[PDB]
Amino acid sequence: MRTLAVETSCDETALAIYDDQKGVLGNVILSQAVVHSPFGGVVPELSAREHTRNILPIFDRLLKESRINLEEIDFISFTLTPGLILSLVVGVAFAKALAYEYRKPLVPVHHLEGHIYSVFLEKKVEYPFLALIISGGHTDLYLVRDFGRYDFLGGTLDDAVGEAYDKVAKMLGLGYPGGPIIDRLAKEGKKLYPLPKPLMEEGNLNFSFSGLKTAILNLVRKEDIAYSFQETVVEILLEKSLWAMKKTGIKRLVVVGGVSANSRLREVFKKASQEYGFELYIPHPSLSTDNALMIAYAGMERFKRGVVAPLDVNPQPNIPLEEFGRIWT
Amino acid sequence: MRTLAVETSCDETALAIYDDQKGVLGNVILSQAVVHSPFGGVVPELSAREHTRNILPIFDRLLKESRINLEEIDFISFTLTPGLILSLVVGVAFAKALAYEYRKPLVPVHHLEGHIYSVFLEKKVEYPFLALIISGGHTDLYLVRDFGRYDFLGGTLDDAVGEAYDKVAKMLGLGYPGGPIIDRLAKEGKKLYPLPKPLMEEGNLNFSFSGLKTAILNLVRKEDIAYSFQETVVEILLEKSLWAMKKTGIKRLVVVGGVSANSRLREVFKKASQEYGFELYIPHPSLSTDNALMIAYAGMERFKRGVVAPLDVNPQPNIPLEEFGRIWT
Amino acid sequence: MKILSIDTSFSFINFSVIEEEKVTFLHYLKSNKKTLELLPKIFEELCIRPENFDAFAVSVGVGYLTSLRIGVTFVKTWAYTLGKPVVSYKNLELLAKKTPVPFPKIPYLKVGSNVFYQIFEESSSSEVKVFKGEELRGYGISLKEFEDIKLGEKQFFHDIFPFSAYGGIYAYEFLKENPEGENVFEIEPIYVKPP
Amino acid sequence: MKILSIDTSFSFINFSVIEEEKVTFLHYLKSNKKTLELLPKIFEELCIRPENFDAFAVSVGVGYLTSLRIGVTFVKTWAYTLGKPVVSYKNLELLAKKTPVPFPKIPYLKVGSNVFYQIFEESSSSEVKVFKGEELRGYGISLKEFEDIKLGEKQFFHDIFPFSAYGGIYAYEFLKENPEGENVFEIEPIYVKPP
Ligand SMILES: [Fe+3]
Ligand SMILES: [Fe+3]
């Protein structure tokens, strides 16, 4: 079977066609980074305008590249929640327009659920497993017992990792995207200055990162700062992940979200899996950032279980992953 | 069970409530004779206006006299056809308004079918039987084999009996209603002049009456004329009825319609049943003219067989009785 | 106050719901179906139920007489049995009152082969007349459906003018000063010609 | 030519079908439901299917921006995939063009806390402005929904003004001279304020 997937939850317009026998049939994305860059962040209204403008041209490219007919699609997958509600409604409108037009079922997907299943595109993972989701406004640990069955283990008490990278780069004056810039300054760092790891109490699976912008101000080459910040963040992520495996007894770890593309993060987690002997799944970088293929995969999982949405299904800015799975599976 | 019946097919607004255990619960009629009298006949547009005006006050009287609640009605019976289409739609609109409002089934009735079943109000008649229907634009013989199963045997090739009475009275100058006036002049007739009986061929069950206004002009007291005309008409009706019993072998005869109230007609048919030994059913005069009780009775018969109309059922000026029975039963 | 307002004057049948002094619902359909094919099935399709309303309004025309008789009979039956107020309204009066052209205003509508019109000045108005070709002083007002028919010195044509919406707003105003509405037994289509 | 015309500018969502140069269908509903709760379920309820139309029309406002983006995205998706023409139309232009009051005409509509208005003379017009209390010369034109807001020297308020009906008639005229319609990729709500 095959699905057209729609993702407009934040600042990327993503459409994809996925076939569970033939694989990727089409995949198109357009980022809005350039337009938000001057504002130092994602501007909600402007993002909504961009989705509205870009979604039809992207679709036209997707149809010309894939050569697929919409009559041959078995169901429309789309991100219902969470995200910017002004952007979410654009993709939902587009998905529901096609579904009604072509008389195809609608299958909703939670965005973080999409990130979990982005690794299944390359390799299926046995249940149960742990998921560290590190992207956007999220730095969460989940125990995934089955599709639709996600137990929340811990999350950030202040800044997510992505927001920490942005706040650090802006702190020492740098481009807005923050991430790439620090990963490149950090590659040039010589000395490793010590920084304090916030929570770090025995068995605590929550995260705190804003207590680093304080010790950072108590300071030297900007390269050593980027290098030292990046090392402390990745170490916090790993230790919390290790504690979660010991607390649960589960030795399969999925690491997903945009920060999972960080080349230093991948080194440290791969090394730890080699030293500790646990299974690690990180997606190809093209799948770490928002895309609709991961939405398509989770949509397949939900459709195959017989779950479709009614025509009047409405997006919401923030249904928790655990609750969404119970509602929709 | 019980029904509210609606009859607006010609120039009488008739509503009734009938209960198949308790009998007549309410019965109200308003004739339009006075208003049509100046025109020498029923004016279609004016009749439609009168139904529209009179149907609500009649209903109010019916509800106050019967004391019944519409919630206690099991289904709405109404005349769908035949008749004046501008008048038919008023009663249908009223019936469908109540049915939709109160969520009650709709059960259509053919007007001549109502006339057949007007005798069942007083006495049930075994099938098969013959029906002579003599009213309005009709002088028909039918073989009724069952409810909804009516075989047309013969009808008028020109004037119906009612129209003949009107044309005769107008010919010799008299009031429009024609019927009552001739039945009263005829009671005063001394000499019986001979008139020619039109069709009267062996085994022919059709009727012709206009060939009498010719021999009438070849003429004396107006009382002897009314008397002679009335005698010839009634004799034609009886002989045709007798031939129909001999051709079919069926010795039960129902005589219905407005002309069945004629006191001379009743004498001659009752006498013939006494002399020939066939069963004769003529309704009380109050049931010979249009009323809704006869519509209610036929509506009971059709409802009990599981037949209801859809909400968009539409009246028509003239579905033949035989075809109506096949369609609706 | 929730009013169900019905217009069966023309082949563009339409009905509105008035609440809080405004149109909250309007359904307008140009159909060649007969009036009794559409009613009351169209109400069932739109989940419109007479017991849900405080009051009813209905057009008495000018319009096609059989379809007016049918609509008026639906509404009188509902209003009388439910004990709810009912307000009649007139199409040519609404067309004049709601169109901001100068006086004199000549609203007109075509029914079969007759063009019915009425003349409105600021403080008086004529009877409904039948047009015979006369030159008329003032501003003709009609519907796009009748754009091929010219009355008066200038003409304004409404692209659309759902009488049930304007009639329902009028009925809402009417019931503020006359909460009992109009006598239900006396509601009749306007008749211009004799039978 | 059969056109499906959609208006998602306000809480009174409405859509029309235009055929033979006239409105043959209009459905108008004032609802507190969210735009995506109503669409496309309301189309399924009324048996409205995009493949049955020759062309589409859609309001680009002024109106509420999220509901405009939603309606425009429905219509662009249908028009593009079916290869059918699409025509955008503007609410304040329709309000001025269809209201026969004298010049200057000041149509206005309220969206959230802003009153948007535009000034129309016989042969020129202004940009869409944001009202700040200024005294204005001419005739204000709005909807009964906004009757409490006064612009200009006199005010006219439409009891009802379903933009999808007027927009569909306009689109019908538009497609006679430009059968290809407007570029589907370029249809966007009107934005008055910056992001
Ligand atoms: Fe994401
Ligand atoms: Fe009769």
Can you describe what's shown?
- The complex is a heterotetramer, with two copies of chain A (329 residues) and two copies of chain C (195 residues).
- Chain A is an alpha/beta fold and 329 residues long.
- Chain A folds into two domains: 2-116 and 288-328, ATPase, nucleotide binding domain (Nucleotidyltransferase, domain 5, 2-Layer Sandwich); 125-282, ATPase, nucleotide binding domain (Nucleotidyltransferase, domain 5), CATH 3.30.420.40.
- Chain A is 42% helix and 20% strand.
- A five-stranded mixed sheet of chain A has the order 3-2-1-4-5, with helices on both faces. Chain A has a five-stranded mixed sheet with strand order 8-7-6-9-10, with helices on both faces.
- In chain A, helix 4 (111-117) packs across helix 10 (293-304).
- Chain A is globular, with a radius of gyration of 20 Å.
- Chain A starts with a strand and ends with a helix.
- Chain C is of the alpha/beta class.
- Chain C has two domains: 2-90 and 161-186, 2-Layer Sandwich (Nucleotidyltransferase, domain 5); 99-158.
- Chain C is 25% helix and 28% strand.
- Chain C has five helices and ten strands.
- Chain C has helices spanning 35-38, 41-45, 65-82, 91-97, 163-177, and strands at 2-7, 12-19, 22-30, 55-59, 86-89, 105-111, 114-117, 129-130, 139-143, 154-158.
- The N and C termini of chain C lie far apart (38 Å).
- Chains in contact: A-D, B-C, C-D.
- Chains A and D meet through helix 2 and helix 3 of A and helix 1, helix 2 and helix 3 of D.
- Strand 3 of chain C pairs antiparallel with strand 3 (22-30) of chain D, so a sheet runs across the interface.
- Bound molecules: fe (iii) ion (2 copies).
- One fe (iii) ion (FE) is lined by residues 111, 115, 135-136, 290 of chain A.
- The site of one fe (iii) ion has 5 residues of chain A, from helix 4.
- Chains A, B: Its main location: cytoplasm.
